[model samples]
Target: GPLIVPYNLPLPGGVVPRMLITILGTVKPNANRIALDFQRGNDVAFHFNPRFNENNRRVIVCNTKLDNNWGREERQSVFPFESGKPFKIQVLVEPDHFKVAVNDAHLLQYNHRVKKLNEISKLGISGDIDLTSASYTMI
Candidate 1:
Protein backbone atom coordinates (compact mmCIF):
# COMPACT_ATOMS: atom_id res chain seq x y z
CA GLY A 1 0.00 0.00 0.00
CA PRO A 2 1.04 3.59 -0.50
CA LEU A 3 1.97 5.92 2.35
CA ILE A 4 -0.82 7.62 4.28
CA VAL A 5 -1.16 10.93 6.13
CA PRO A 6 -3.92 11.84 8.54
CA TYR A 7 -4.97 15.27 9.92
CA ASN A 8 -7.76 16.34 12.28
CA LEU A 9 -8.52 20.02 12.55
CA PRO A 10 -11.32 22.59 12.22
CA LEU A 11 -10.65 24.71 9.19
CA PRO A 12 -12.33 28.06 8.50
CA GLY A 13 -14.49 26.31 5.87
CA GLY A 14 -13.80 29.24 3.65
CA VAL A 15 -10.06 29.37 3.16
CA VAL A 16 -8.98 26.64 0.74
CA PRO A 17 -5.78 24.63 0.55
CA ARG A 18 -4.14 22.55 -2.12
CA MET A 19 -4.13 18.74 -1.98
CA LEU A 20 -1.40 16.73 -3.70
CA ILE A 21 -0.86 12.98 -3.78
CA THR A 22 2.75 11.86 -4.12
CA ILE A 23 3.98 8.32 -3.83
CA LEU A 24 6.92 6.70 -5.51
CA GLY A 25 6.76 3.33 -7.31
CA THR A 26 2.99 3.39 -7.80
CA VAL A 27 1.61 2.87 -11.28
CA LYS A 28 -0.51 5.42 -13.14
CA PRO A 29 -3.16 2.81 -13.79
CA ASN A 30 -6.80 3.59 -13.12
CA ALA A 31 -8.57 2.98 -9.84
CA ASN A 32 -12.09 3.11 -8.42
CA ARG A 33 -11.49 5.80 -5.80
CA ILE A 34 -9.02 7.60 -3.56
CA ALA A 35 -9.34 6.87 0.12
CA LEU A 36 -9.80 9.60 2.81
CA ASP A 37 -11.22 10.40 6.25
CA PHE A 38 -13.45 13.24 7.48
CA GLN A 39 -15.74 14.27 10.33
CA ARG A 40 -17.62 17.26 11.67
CA GLY A 41 -15.66 19.76 13.73
CA ASN A 42 -15.48 18.81 17.38
CA ASP A 43 -14.27 22.04 18.91
CA VAL A 44 -10.79 21.06 17.70
CA ALA A 45 -10.71 19.26 14.34
CA PHE A 46 -11.94 19.60 10.77
CA HIS A 47 -12.76 16.64 8.53
CA PHE A 48 -11.94 16.05 4.86
CA ASN A 49 -13.12 13.70 2.13
CA PRO A 50 -10.79 12.95 -0.78
CA ARG A 51 -11.83 11.43 -4.07
CA PHE A 52 -11.59 11.75 -7.84
CA ASN A 53 -13.87 12.57 -10.78
CA GLU A 54 -15.10 9.73 -12.95
CA ASN A 55 -16.73 11.49 -15.90
CA ASN A 56 -13.96 14.05 -16.52
CA ARG A 57 -11.10 12.18 -14.85
CA ARG A 58 -9.97 14.86 -12.41
CA VAL A 59 -9.19 14.98 -8.73
CA ILE A 60 -12.12 15.99 -6.53
CA VAL A 61 -11.91 17.23 -2.97
CA CYS A 62 -15.07 15.89 -1.41
CA ASN A 63 -15.82 18.13 1.54
CA THR A 64 -18.85 19.71 3.19
CA LYS A 65 -19.99 23.16 4.14
CA LEU A 66 -20.06 23.78 7.85
CA ASP A 67 -23.23 25.84 7.79
CA ASN A 68 -25.20 23.44 5.64
CA ASN A 69 -25.37 20.51 8.01
CA TRP A 70 -28.65 19.83 9.78
CA GLY A 71 -27.95 17.89 12.99
CA ARG A 72 -26.79 14.70 11.17
CA GLU A 73 -25.88 15.53 7.59
CA GLU A 74 -28.72 15.57 5.13
CA ARG A 75 -26.59 14.59 2.16
CA GLN A 76 -23.36 12.88 1.23
CA SER A 77 -21.85 12.61 -2.20
CA VAL A 78 -19.19 10.88 -4.27
CA PHE A 79 -18.84 13.47 -6.92
CA PRO A 80 -16.94 13.56 -10.20
CA PHE A 81 -13.71 11.85 -9.19
CA GLU A 82 -10.67 10.55 -11.04
CA SER A 83 -7.79 8.17 -10.46
CA GLY A 84 -5.28 9.58 -8.04
CA LYS A 85 -2.65 7.10 -9.15
CA PRO A 86 1.01 8.03 -9.02
CA PHE A 87 0.23 11.71 -9.15
CA LYS A 88 0.41 14.96 -7.19
CA ILE A 89 -2.74 17.08 -6.92
CA GLN A 90 -2.29 20.82 -6.75
CA VAL A 91 -5.37 22.53 -5.34
CA LEU A 92 -5.63 26.28 -5.32
CA VAL A 93 -7.31 28.25 -2.55
CA GLU A 94 -9.28 31.45 -2.98
CA PRO A 95 -12.40 33.29 -1.92
CA ASP A 96 -13.94 32.65 -5.31
CA HIS A 97 -11.98 29.84 -6.88
CA PHE A 98 -10.86 26.48 -5.58
CA LYS A 99 -8.97 24.53 -8.20
CA VAL A 100 -7.28 21.10 -8.22
CA ALA A 101 -4.97 19.03 -10.38
CA VAL A 102 -3.89 15.42 -10.83
CA ASN A 103 -0.17 14.71 -11.32
CA ASP A 104 0.20 18.44 -11.95
CA ALA A 105 -0.93 17.68 -15.50
CA HIS A 106 -4.72 17.83 -15.35
CA LEU A 107 -6.64 20.69 -13.76
CA LEU A 108 -10.20 21.56 -12.73
CA GLN A 109 -11.70 24.61 -11.06
CA TYR A 110 -14.43 24.82 -8.45
CA ASN A 111 -16.44 28.01 -8.50
CA HIS A 112 -18.21 27.84 -5.12
CA ARG A 113 -15.02 28.44 -3.15
CA VAL A 114 -15.19 28.51 0.60
CA LYS A 115 -15.24 31.97 2.16
CA LYS A 116 -13.90 31.41 5.66
CA LEU A 117 -10.17 30.85 6.03
CA ASN A 118 -9.80 32.47 9.43
CA GLU A 119 -12.12 30.03 11.19
CA ILE A 120 -10.61 26.67 10.21
CA SER A 121 -7.19 25.03 10.20
CA LYS A 122 -7.52 21.52 11.53
CA LEU A 123 -8.13 18.98 8.76
CA GLY A 124 -8.25 15.21 8.98
CA ILE A 125 -6.28 13.70 6.11
CA SER A 126 -6.04 9.97 5.42
CA GLY A 127 -3.30 9.62 2.80
CA ASP A 128 -0.06 11.53 3.07
CA ILE A 129 -1.31 15.11 3.39
CA ASP A 130 2.19 16.42 3.91
CA LEU A 131 3.02 17.96 0.55
CA THR A 132 6.57 18.95 1.54
CA SER A 133 7.70 15.34 1.36
CA ALA A 134 6.75 15.07 -2.30
CA SER A 135 8.22 18.39 -3.51
CA TYR A 136 5.25 20.77 -3.61
CA THR A 137 5.65 24.53 -3.46
CA MET A 138 2.90 26.61 -1.80
CA ILE A 139 2.38 30.24 -2.70
Candidate 2:
Protein backbone atom coordinates (compact mmCIF):
# COMPACT_ATOMS: atom_id res chain seq x y z
CA GLY A 1 0.00 0.00 0.00
CA PRO A 2 1.12 3.55 -0.68
CA LEU A 3 -0.41 5.02 2.45
CA ILE A 4 -3.24 6.29 0.31
CA VAL A 5 -6.72 4.90 0.55
CA PRO A 6 -8.61 6.77 -2.14
CA TYR A 7 -7.08 8.13 -5.29
CA ASN A 8 -8.92 10.68 -7.36
CA LEU A 9 -8.36 11.62 -10.98
CA PRO A 10 -10.07 14.07 -13.26
CA LEU A 11 -11.06 13.32 -16.83
CA PRO A 12 -10.79 16.63 -18.70
CA GLY A 13 -12.80 15.85 -21.80
CA GLY A 14 -14.99 13.53 -19.85
CA VAL A 15 -15.74 9.90 -20.71
CA VAL A 16 -17.27 9.75 -24.10
CA PRO A 17 -18.18 6.49 -25.80
CA ARG A 18 -15.16 4.42 -26.84
CA MET A 19 -13.16 5.67 -23.90
CA LEU A 20 -11.24 3.23 -21.74
CA ILE A 21 -10.01 3.17 -18.17
CA THR A 22 -7.20 0.80 -17.30
CA ILE A 23 -6.05 0.01 -13.82
CA LEU A 24 -3.28 -2.30 -12.64
CA GLY A 25 -3.07 -3.24 -9.01
CA THR A 26 -2.86 -5.94 -6.38
CA VAL A 27 -5.41 -6.81 -3.75
CA LYS A 28 -4.11 -7.23 -0.23
CA PRO A 29 -4.96 -10.38 1.60
CA ASN A 30 -7.50 -9.92 4.39
CA ALA A 31 -8.69 -6.78 2.69
CA ASN A 32 -12.29 -5.81 3.17
CA ARG A 33 -12.85 -4.61 -0.37
CA ILE A 34 -11.92 -2.39 -3.30
CA ALA A 35 -13.96 0.02 -5.36
CA LEU A 36 -13.78 2.09 -8.55
CA ASP A 37 -16.13 4.92 -9.26
CA PHE A 38 -16.94 7.04 -12.26
CA GLN A 39 -18.61 10.20 -11.24
CA ARG A 40 -19.92 13.59 -12.27
CA GLY A 41 -20.19 15.83 -9.26
CA ASN A 42 -22.48 14.08 -6.77
CA ASP A 43 -23.75 11.54 -9.25
CA VAL A 44 -21.91 8.29 -9.63
CA ALA A 45 -22.28 7.03 -13.16
CA PHE A 46 -20.80 3.64 -12.42
CA HIS A 47 -19.70 1.85 -9.31
CA PHE A 48 -17.51 -1.24 -9.41
CA ASN A 49 -16.93 -2.92 -6.11
CA PRO A 50 -15.23 -6.17 -5.21
CA ARG A 51 -16.13 -7.29 -1.76
CA PHE A 52 -14.03 -9.82 0.07
CA ASN A 53 -16.42 -10.30 2.93
CA GLU A 54 -19.88 -10.22 1.51
CA ASN A 55 -22.23 -13.10 2.36
CA ASN A 56 -19.34 -14.58 4.34
CA ARG A 57 -17.47 -14.83 1.06
CA ARG A 58 -16.32 -12.73 -1.89
CA VAL A 59 -17.98 -11.30 -4.98
CA ILE A 60 -17.92 -8.49 -7.52
CA VAL A 61 -20.77 -6.02 -7.53
CA CYS A 62 -21.70 -3.32 -10.03
CA ASN A 63 -24.24 -0.55 -9.88
CA THR A 64 -25.03 3.09 -10.51
CA LYS A 65 -25.88 5.87 -8.14
CA LEU A 66 -27.89 8.94 -8.96
CA ASP A 67 -28.98 11.66 -6.56
CA ASN A 68 -27.89 9.47 -3.63
CA ASN A 69 -30.12 6.61 -4.76
CA TRP A 70 -28.43 3.41 -5.80
CA GLY A 71 -29.73 1.23 -8.57
CA ARG A 72 -30.04 -2.53 -8.43
CA GLU A 73 -26.84 -4.31 -7.68
CA GLU A 74 -25.49 -6.71 -10.28
CA ARG A 75 -23.32 -9.48 -8.92
CA GLN A 76 -21.01 -11.73 -10.85
CA SER A 77 -21.13 -15.42 -10.01
CA VAL A 78 -17.62 -16.19 -11.22
CA PHE A 79 -14.85 -14.78 -9.09
CA PRO A 80 -11.56 -14.86 -10.96
CA PHE A 81 -9.95 -12.74 -8.29
CA GLU A 82 -8.02 -13.67 -5.18
CA SER A 83 -6.56 -11.81 -2.29
CA GLY A 84 -2.85 -10.96 -2.40
CA LYS A 85 -2.75 -11.27 -6.18
CA PRO A 86 -2.26 -8.86 -9.03
CA PHE A 87 -5.23 -7.77 -11.13
CA LYS A 88 -5.86 -5.94 -14.36
CA ILE A 89 -9.14 -4.08 -14.69
CA GLN A 90 -10.18 -2.52 -17.95
CA VAL A 91 -13.40 -0.59 -18.47
CA LEU A 92 -14.60 0.25 -21.93
CA VAL A 93 -17.25 2.90 -22.45
CA GLU A 94 -19.83 1.93 -25.01
CA PRO A 95 -22.65 3.96 -26.40
CA ASP A 96 -25.15 2.26 -24.15
CA HIS A 97 -23.08 0.43 -21.55
CA PHE A 98 -19.70 -0.17 -20.03
CA LYS A 99 -17.86 -3.41 -20.73
CA VAL A 100 -15.42 -4.61 -18.14
CA ALA A 101 -12.52 -7.03 -18.35
CA VAL A 102 -10.52 -8.64 -15.61
CA ASN A 103 -7.12 -10.07 -16.35
CA ASP A 104 -7.73 -9.77 -20.07
CA ALA A 105 -11.00 -11.69 -19.95
CA HIS A 106 -14.45 -10.21 -20.43
CA LEU A 107 -16.23 -9.96 -17.12
CA LEU A 108 -19.44 -7.94 -16.98
CA GLN A 109 -21.28 -5.05 -18.57
CA TYR A 110 -23.04 -2.15 -16.83
CA ASN A 111 -25.66 -0.36 -18.86
CA HIS A 112 -25.71 3.41 -18.84
CA ARG A 113 -28.02 4.65 -16.15
CA VAL A 114 -26.79 8.19 -16.63
CA LYS A 115 -26.68 8.27 -20.40
CA LYS A 116 -24.67 11.47 -20.61
CA LEU A 117 -21.26 9.83 -20.68
CA ASN A 118 -19.55 13.14 -21.15
CA GLU A 119 -20.63 14.18 -17.72
CA ILE A 120 -18.43 11.52 -16.18
CA SER A 121 -15.74 13.93 -15.10
CA LYS A 122 -13.89 12.00 -12.46
CA LEU A 123 -12.52 8.61 -11.50
CA GLY A 124 -12.07 7.61 -7.91
CA ILE A 125 -10.50 4.47 -6.48
CA SER A 126 -10.20 3.21 -2.95
CA GLY A 127 -9.63 0.16 -0.77
CA ASP A 128 -7.00 -2.32 0.30
CA ILE A 129 -5.01 -2.39 -2.90
CA ASP A 130 -1.77 -1.10 -4.37
CA LEU A 131 -1.93 0.55 -7.74
CA THR A 132 1.02 0.31 -10.08
CA SER A 133 -0.51 2.30 -12.89
CA ALA A 134 -3.75 3.84 -14.14
CA SER A 135 -4.69 5.48 -17.40
CA TYR A 136 -7.68 7.09 -19.10
CA THR A 137 -7.75 7.10 -22.86
CA MET A 138 -10.25 7.91 -25.53
CA ILE A 139 -9.88 4.85 -27.65
Candidate 3:
Protein backbone atom coordinates (compact mmCIF):
# COMPACT_ATOMS: atom_id res chain seq x y z
CA GLY A 1 0.00 0.00 0.00
CA PRO A 2 2.00 2.97 -1.25
CA LEU A 3 0.62 5.96 0.63
CA ILE A 4 1.30 9.17 2.47
CA VAL A 5 -1.26 10.30 5.00
CA PRO A 6 -1.89 13.63 6.70
CA TYR A 7 0.17 15.95 4.54
CA ASN A 8 0.07 18.91 6.89
CA LEU A 9 0.98 21.53 4.31
CA PRO A 10 0.57 24.92 5.89
CA LEU A 11 -0.73 28.03 4.21
CA PRO A 12 2.18 30.47 4.53
CA GLY A 13 -0.02 33.55 4.86
CA GLY A 14 -3.23 31.79 5.66
CA VAL A 15 -6.01 31.39 3.14
CA VAL A 16 -7.52 34.22 1.13
CA PRO A 17 -10.54 34.20 -1.16
CA ARG A 18 -8.37 33.38 -4.14
CA MET A 19 -6.15 30.66 -2.72
CA LEU A 20 -6.04 27.30 -4.40
CA ILE A 21 -4.90 23.88 -3.22
CA THR A 22 -4.04 21.23 -5.74
CA ILE A 23 -3.54 17.59 -4.81
CA LEU A 24 -2.39 14.85 -7.13
CA GLY A 25 -2.77 11.29 -6.05
CA THR A 26 -3.70 7.77 -6.99
CA VAL A 27 -6.58 5.84 -5.49
CA LYS A 28 -5.44 2.48 -4.34
CA PRO A 29 -7.46 -0.51 -5.45
CA ASN A 30 -7.68 -1.68 -1.87
CA ALA A 31 -8.84 1.70 -0.75
CA ASN A 32 -12.05 2.06 1.13
CA ARG A 33 -12.00 5.85 1.33
CA ILE A 34 -9.93 9.05 1.20
CA ALA A 35 -10.33 12.40 2.97
CA LEU A 36 -8.95 15.91 2.59
CA ASP A 37 -9.41 18.27 5.50
CA PHE A 38 -8.78 21.98 5.62
CA GLN A 39 -8.40 22.88 9.22
CA ARG A 40 -6.97 25.09 11.93
CA GLY A 41 -6.35 23.70 15.36
CA ASN A 42 -9.04 21.10 15.88
CA ASP A 43 -11.75 22.67 13.76
CA VAL A 44 -12.21 21.33 10.29
CA ALA A 45 -13.44 23.96 7.86
CA PHE A 46 -14.03 21.58 5.02
CA HIS A 47 -14.18 17.82 5.11
CA PHE A 48 -13.94 16.29 1.66
CA ASN A 49 -14.29 12.54 1.71
CA PRO A 50 -14.68 10.15 -1.17
CA ARG A 51 -15.71 6.65 -0.28
CA PHE A 52 -15.25 3.84 -2.72
CA ASN A 53 -17.53 1.65 -0.65
CA GLU A 54 -20.26 4.17 0.00
CA ASN A 55 -23.67 3.54 -1.53
CA ASN A 56 -22.02 1.24 -4.01
CA ARG A 57 -19.64 3.97 -5.18
CA ARG A 58 -22.38 6.39 -6.22
CA VAL A 59 -21.86 9.33 -3.89
CA ILE A 60 -19.20 11.69 -2.55
CA VAL A 61 -19.68 13.19 0.91
CA CYS A 62 -18.73 16.68 1.98
CA ASN A 63 -19.19 18.54 5.23
CA THR A 64 -17.63 20.53 8.06
CA LYS A 65 -16.56 19.66 11.56
CA LEU A 66 -16.10 22.07 14.43
CA ASP A 67 -15.24 21.22 18.01
CA ASN A 68 -15.53 17.59 17.05
CA ASN A 69 -19.09 18.09 15.90
CA TRP A 70 -20.08 17.36 12.34
CA GLY A 71 -22.49 19.42 10.30
CA ARG A 72 -25.01 18.06 7.87
CA GLU A 73 -23.49 15.88 5.19
CA GLU A 74 -23.69 17.06 1.61
CA ARG A 75 -23.77 14.31 -0.94
CA GLN A 76 -23.00 14.59 -4.62
CA SER A 77 -24.33 12.04 -7.04
CA VAL A 78 -21.32 12.03 -9.27
CA PHE A 79 -18.39 9.74 -8.56
CA PRO A 80 -15.17 10.85 -10.23
CA PHE A 81 -12.81 8.61 -8.26
CA GLU A 82 -11.62 5.27 -9.48
CA SER A 83 -9.55 2.61 -7.78
CA GLY A 84 -5.98 2.03 -8.96
CA LYS A 85 -6.00 5.31 -10.91
CA PRO A 86 -4.58 8.78 -10.52
CA PHE A 87 -6.65 11.89 -9.72
CA LYS A 88 -6.28 15.59 -9.30
CA ILE A 89 -8.27 17.47 -6.67
CA GLN A 90 -8.30 21.23 -6.77
CA VAL A 91 -9.89 23.32 -4.05
CA LEU A 92 -10.34 27.01 -4.59
CA VAL A 93 -11.22 29.26 -1.74
CA GLU A 94 -13.86 31.90 -2.39
CA PRO A 95 -15.63 34.51 -0.33
CA ASP A 96 -18.58 32.28 0.40
CA HIS A 97 -17.63 28.75 -0.44
CA PHE A 98 -14.90 26.42 -1.52
CA LYS A 99 -15.09 25.28 -5.10
CA VAL A 100 -13.75 21.76 -5.53
CA ALA A 101 -12.83 20.00 -8.73
CA VAL A 102 -11.70 16.48 -9.53
CA ASN A 103 -9.55 15.67 -12.52
CA ASP A 104 -9.85 19.31 -13.65
CA ALA A 105 -13.64 19.07 -13.81
CA HIS A 106 -15.93 20.91 -11.43
CA LEU A 107 -17.32 18.69 -8.76
CA LEU A 108 -19.21 20.73 -6.16
CA GLN A 109 -19.05 23.64 -3.76
CA TYR A 110 -18.90 23.44 0.02
CA ASN A 111 -20.13 26.41 2.01
CA HIS A 112 -18.14 28.13 4.73
CA ARG A 113 -19.91 26.81 7.73
CA VAL A 114 -17.01 27.49 10.07
CA LYS A 115 -16.21 30.90 8.63
CA LYS A 116 -12.86 32.72 9.10
CA LEU A 117 -10.99 31.53 6.06
CA ASN A 118 -7.70 32.67 7.50
CA GLU A 119 -8.18 30.33 10.39
CA ILE A 120 -7.78 27.47 7.97
CA SER A 121 -4.02 27.20 8.01
CA LYS A 122 -3.35 23.54 7.49
CA LEU A 123 -4.16 20.93 4.89
CA GLY A 124 -4.61 17.48 6.41
CA ILE A 125 -4.98 14.55 4.09
CA SER A 126 -5.40 10.98 5.28
CA GLY A 127 -6.79 7.66 4.22
CA ASP A 128 -6.51 5.04 1.51
CA ILE A 129 -5.03 7.05 -1.32
CA ASP A 130 -1.42 7.45 -2.39
CA LEU A 131 -0.43 11.06 -2.74
CA THR A 132 2.07 11.90 -5.46
CA SER A 133 2.23 15.62 -4.94
CA ALA A 134 0.50 18.51 -3.17
CA SER A 135 0.85 22.23 -3.68
CA TYR A 136 -0.77 25.52 -2.73
CA THR A 137 -0.91 28.81 -4.60
CA MET A 138 -2.59 32.18 -4.33
CA ILE A 139 -4.43 33.88 -7.17
Candidate 4:
Protein backbone atom coordinates (compact mmCIF):
# COMPACT_ATOMS: atom_id res chain seq x y z
CA GLY A 1 0.00 0.00 0.00
CA PRO A 2 3.06 2.23 -0.20
CA LEU A 3 6.11 3.05 -2.30
CA ILE A 4 9.08 5.32 -1.72
CA VAL A 5 7.53 8.08 0.36
CA PRO A 6 9.71 11.01 -0.62
CA TYR A 7 11.44 10.62 -3.97
CA ASN A 8 14.19 13.15 -4.69
CA LEU A 9 15.75 13.09 -8.15
CA PRO A 10 18.32 15.08 -10.11
CA LEU A 11 17.65 16.71 -13.47
CA PRO A 12 20.23 15.75 -16.09
CA GLY A 13 19.95 18.80 -18.33
CA GLY A 14 18.70 21.02 -15.54
CA VAL A 15 15.39 22.85 -15.99
CA VAL A 16 15.85 23.66 -19.61
CA PRO A 17 13.15 24.61 -22.10
CA ARG A 18 11.42 21.76 -23.96
CA MET A 19 11.90 19.34 -21.07
CA LEU A 20 8.98 17.24 -19.95
CA ILE A 21 8.81 15.76 -16.47
CA THR A 22 6.27 13.00 -16.03
CA ILE A 23 5.16 11.18 -12.91
CA LEU A 24 2.87 8.18 -12.63
CA GLY A 25 1.30 7.38 -9.30
CA THR A 26 -1.79 6.35 -7.37
CA VAL A 27 -3.23 8.20 -4.46
CA LYS A 28 -3.95 6.40 -1.22
CA PRO A 29 -7.61 6.16 -0.30
CA ASN A 30 -7.00 7.67 3.10
CA ALA A 31 -4.66 10.32 1.86
CA ASN A 32 -5.06 13.96 2.63
CA ARG A 33 -2.17 15.60 0.83
CA ILE A 34 0.67 15.18 -1.67
CA ALA A 35 3.34 17.53 -3.05
CA LEU A 36 5.81 18.05 -5.86
CA ASP A 37 8.84 20.29 -5.60
CA PHE A 38 11.30 21.58 -8.14
CA GLN A 39 14.39 22.65 -6.32
CA ARG A 40 17.59 24.60 -6.78
CA GLY A 41 19.93 23.58 -3.98
CA ASN A 42 17.92 24.19 -0.79
CA ASP A 43 15.29 26.47 -2.27
CA VAL A 44 12.08 25.30 -3.89
CA ALA A 45 11.63 26.81 -7.32
CA PHE A 46 8.15 25.34 -7.70
CA HIS A 47 5.88 23.77 -5.11
CA PHE A 48 2.84 21.90 -6.38
CA ASN A 49 0.47 20.68 -3.74
CA PRO A 50 -2.88 18.92 -3.79
CA ARG A 51 -4.69 18.93 -0.51
CA PHE A 52 -7.78 16.79 -0.08
CA ASN A 53 -9.06 18.03 3.21
CA GLU A 54 -8.32 21.70 3.37
CA ASN A 55 -11.11 23.34 5.40
CA ASN A 56 -13.55 20.90 3.86
CA ARG A 57 -12.52 21.94 0.38
CA ARG A 58 -10.06 20.23 -1.93
CA VAL A 59 -7.40 22.53 -3.33
CA ILE A 60 -4.31 22.49 -5.50
CA VAL A 61 -1.68 25.11 -4.75
CA CYS A 62 1.24 26.30 -6.79
CA ASN A 63 3.94 28.54 -5.45
CA THR A 64 7.65 29.14 -4.96
CA LYS A 65 10.08 29.32 -2.11
CA LEU A 66 13.21 31.40 -2.63
CA ASP A 67 16.00 31.89 -0.11
CA ASN A 68 13.87 30.08 2.52
CA ASN A 69 10.95 32.45 1.95
CA TRP A 70 7.67 31.46 0.32
CA GLY A 71 6.02 33.61 -2.31
CA ARG A 72 2.36 34.19 -3.01
CA GLU A 73 0.38 31.08 -3.77
CA GLU A 74 -1.52 30.36 -6.97
CA ARG A 75 -4.48 28.33 -5.78
CA GLN A 76 -6.69 26.63 -8.30
CA SER A 77 -10.37 25.88 -7.71
CA VAL A 78 -10.19 22.61 -9.56
CA PHE A 79 -9.00 19.44 -7.85
CA PRO A 80 -7.69 17.05 -10.47
CA PHE A 81 -6.63 14.22 -8.18
CA GLU A 82 -8.83 11.53 -6.73
CA SER A 83 -8.28 9.07 -3.95
CA GLY A 84 -7.65 5.42 -4.89
CA LYS A 85 -7.12 6.28 -8.52
CA PRO A 86 -4.05 6.15 -10.73
CA PHE A 87 -2.91 9.47 -12.15
CA LYS A 88 -0.41 10.93 -14.54
CA ILE A 89 1.12 14.32 -13.95
CA GLN A 90 3.22 15.97 -16.62
CA VAL A 91 5.22 19.15 -16.34
CA LEU A 92 6.32 20.97 -19.44
CA VAL A 93 9.28 23.25 -19.02
CA GLU A 94 8.97 26.43 -21.05
CA PRO A 95 11.24 29.44 -21.42
CA ASP A 96 9.55 31.39 -18.64
CA HIS A 97 6.93 29.09 -17.15
CA PHE A 98 5.98 25.54 -16.19
CA LYS A 99 2.87 23.90 -17.58
CA VAL A 100 1.33 21.21 -15.44
CA ALA A 101 -1.13 18.69 -16.75
CA VAL A 102 -3.14 16.17 -14.78
CA ASN A 103 -4.37 13.03 -16.46
CA ASP A 104 -3.43 14.46 -19.89
CA ALA A 105 -5.39 17.68 -19.31
CA HIS A 106 -3.80 21.08 -18.80
CA LEU A 107 -3.98 22.07 -15.14
CA LEU A 108 -1.97 25.21 -14.53
CA GLN A 109 0.94 27.42 -15.54
CA TYR A 110 3.55 28.61 -13.08
CA ASN A 111 5.94 31.34 -14.10
CA HIS A 112 9.62 31.24 -13.21
CA ARG A 113 10.46 32.62 -9.82
CA VAL A 114 14.06 31.56 -9.99
CA LYS A 115 15.01 33.10 -13.36
CA LYS A 116 18.16 31.00 -13.89
CA LEU A 117 16.51 27.80 -15.04
CA ASN A 118 19.65 25.71 -14.68
CA GLU A 119 19.58 26.25 -10.94
CA ILE A 120 16.38 24.23 -10.69
CA SER A 121 17.92 20.88 -11.26
CA LYS A 122 16.18 18.68 -8.73
CA LEU A 123 12.74 17.06 -8.52
CA GLY A 124 11.30 16.11 -5.15
CA ILE A 125 7.95 14.53 -4.31
CA SER A 126 6.38 13.37 -1.09
CA GLY A 127 3.13 12.41 0.64
CA ASP A 128 0.40 9.79 0.27
CA ILE A 129 0.85 8.48 -3.22
CA ASP A 130 2.46 5.24 -4.39
CA LEU A 131 4.82 6.26 -7.13
CA THR A 132 4.96 4.10 -10.25
CA SER A 133 7.62 6.14 -12.06
CA ALA A 134 9.18 9.57 -12.30
CA SER A 135 11.20 10.69 -15.28
CA TYR A 136 12.25 13.64 -17.38
CA THR A 137 12.95 14.02 -21.09
CA MET A 138 14.59 16.78 -23.11
CA ILE A 139 12.30 17.26 -26.11
Which is the leading candidate under lDDT? 4
Ranking according to TM-score, highest score first: 4, 2, 3, 1
Task: Tell me the whole-model lDDT of each prediction, alpha carbons only.
Answer: 0.39, 0.87, 0.85, 0.91
Give the poorly placed runs of model 1, Cα more than 4 Å off.
1-3, 7-32, 35-63, 67-84, 127-137
Tens-place lDDT per residue, model 1, 24-118, is 32322454344322233432212223434346543334444555542222113434333333445445554554455555544554444234444
Candidate 1: minimum summed lDDT over ten consecutive residues — where? 19-28
RMSD of each: 7.2, 1.7, 2.0, 1.6
What is the C-alpha RMSD, rounded to one decimal, of candidate 4?
1.6
lDDT of model 1 at residue 4? 40
> How would the candidate models be sorted by lDDT, starting from the highest?
4, 2, 3, 1
| lDDT per residue as tens, model 4, 9-120 | 7896478999999999999998899999999888999999999999989999888997889999999989889999999999999998999999999999999888888888
TM-score, one value per model: 0.45, 0.93, 0.92, 0.95
Q: Tell me the deviation in Å of residue 24 in model 3.
A: 0.5
lDDT of 1 at 35: 38
Candidate 2 clash pair list: none
lDDT of 3 by residue, 1-139 (tens): 3335767888865688988889999888878888888887898888898888865665688988888999999998898988899999999999998999999999999888877777788889988878888898888
Cα lDDT tens digits for candidate 2, 4-53: 55888788867888888898888888888899999988998899998888
Residue 85 displacement in candidate 4 (angstroms): 0.5
